[PDB]
Every structure is written in structure tokens, then in C-alpha cells.
């Protein structure tokens, strides 16, 4: 669709080249960062490099489904991290920029 | 009087403000009445959908994205400072599925 290809190449693009992106390119490695408990408190994991593979597999029917996972991305981290965490920044900078580019998306 | 602040207002605020789990949020977080003495250390940027809809009645916001900011720090102040199991969180994710599926329709310009 017009609205799937928007958040492939106008929102999923800026979003990517960001300096805050690169936590969220790949899904959160609980063993690799030392996080026995992410997965106990984190049941539905995001991230863009699933969300934009996704976008060029033809996985979503309906552009509400693609930004419901970016919305999961970023709930996830709120809830797991602590409040004073960067990454909480660092998410909710990301998130601005995705709920700015999304007010442009076709109808 | 922009086509996407109407969009807001009659689709978005309509259908929430109404929803059933809406009522922790239709007014600030009281932090006396819910025993809350670190909420304000927290959250710095409080916000609920009283606000947001006294806003849009009242024509204070100049671009939609605006209004929907608004919308977004309600729900991660709620996701920030609640604990993962409290059950406010899961009302939260469900007025904001919401939220983003109305977004999804919204008029462009
Ligand atoms: C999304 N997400 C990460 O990407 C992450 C992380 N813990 C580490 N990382 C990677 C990076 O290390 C310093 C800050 O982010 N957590 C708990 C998380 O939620
Ligand atoms: C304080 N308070 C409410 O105000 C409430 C409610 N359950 C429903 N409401 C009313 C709300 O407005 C009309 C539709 O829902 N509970 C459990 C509650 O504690
Ligand atoms: C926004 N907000 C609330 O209104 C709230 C609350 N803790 C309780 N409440 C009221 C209600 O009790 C059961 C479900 O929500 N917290 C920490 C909060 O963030």
C-alpha cells in the first residue's frame, strides 16, 4: 500500500540513521547484555530490524499493524528500563520523530 | 480549524475519552488522593486527556502533531512510571491502540 511504503521509506528511514537509532536495530540480546529477566517482563519484543524486514516481506495487510509494532518497541522499553535510563531518552526522542513523520502519512 | 485538529477531536478524543477504561485518565494524576509522593519526581510533563480535550475545545494547539504528543507523553508517563504488572498499564496499551489505529486515518496537511 501507499501508507506500508510511507513507513518503509520516509518513517523507517529517518528513524534508522538516527544517532539514538542503534539500540533498536536489532531485537534486545538478553544473554548478550545480561538481562535474565528482560523476556519475564518483556512478552511481546520490537524492534525495527524485524519491523523493517517485515515491511520489505509484505508481512503487514494494513499500515495501523506496522505502527502498532514501532508502538510495541517503544512501550517495551519504558516498561522494562528505570526512568532515569538514557535509552528512555533515547526512545522517546525516536518516538517523537515516528508520531511527527506518521501525522504526514496519505489518509 | 485544521482538518487533522477536527480528525482529533471528533475521531480520536471522541472514541477515547468515552472508552471504558478511560476514566484513570480523563484528569491529572492526583498524587495526594492516589498516594503517590514520588509521581512528581517521576514524571515531569504530566498529562491527561482532560487537558487534551480542554485543548482542542478551546483551539490552543497550532499543528496536529502537537495534539498527538500530548497523547503520546499521557501514555509513556504511564508506562514510566507504573510498575509492568499494574493493571493502569494494560488500559494504557489498549487507549493507545487505539489512539494509533484512529492516527492511521487521519487527514494529511
Ligand atoms: C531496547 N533495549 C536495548 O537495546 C538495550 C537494553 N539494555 C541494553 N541495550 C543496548 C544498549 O546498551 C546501552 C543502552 O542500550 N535494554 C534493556 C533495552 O530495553
Ligand atoms: C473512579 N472509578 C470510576 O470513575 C469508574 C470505575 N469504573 C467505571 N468508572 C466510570 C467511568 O466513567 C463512565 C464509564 O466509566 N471505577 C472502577 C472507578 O474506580
Ligand atoms: C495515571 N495513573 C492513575 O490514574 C493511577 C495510578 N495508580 C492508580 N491510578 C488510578 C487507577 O487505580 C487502578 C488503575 O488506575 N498511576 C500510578 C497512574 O499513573
Not at 538514557?86 to 506518521?102: G, H, P, R, S, W
Request: with cysteine; proline share 6%.
Amino acid at each position: 500500500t501507499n501508507q506500508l511504503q510511507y513507513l518503509h521509506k520516509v518513517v523507517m528511514k529517518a528513524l534508522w540513521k538516527h544517532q539514538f537509532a542503534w539500540p533498536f536495530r536489532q531485537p534486545v540480546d538478553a544473554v548478550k547484555l545480561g538481562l535474565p529477566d528482560y523476556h519475564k517482563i518483556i512478552k511481546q519484543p520490537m524492534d525495527m530490524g524485524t519491523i523493517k524486514r517485515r515491511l520489505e516481506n509484505n508481512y503487514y495487510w494494513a499500515a495501523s499493524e506496522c505502527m502498532q509494532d514501532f508502538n510495541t518497541m517503544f512501550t517495551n522499553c519504558y516498561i522494562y528500563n528505570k526512568p532515569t535510563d538514557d535509552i528512555v531518552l533515547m526512545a522517546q526522542t525516536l518516538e517523537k520523530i515516528f508520531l511527527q513523520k506518521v501525522a504526514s502519512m496519505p489518509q
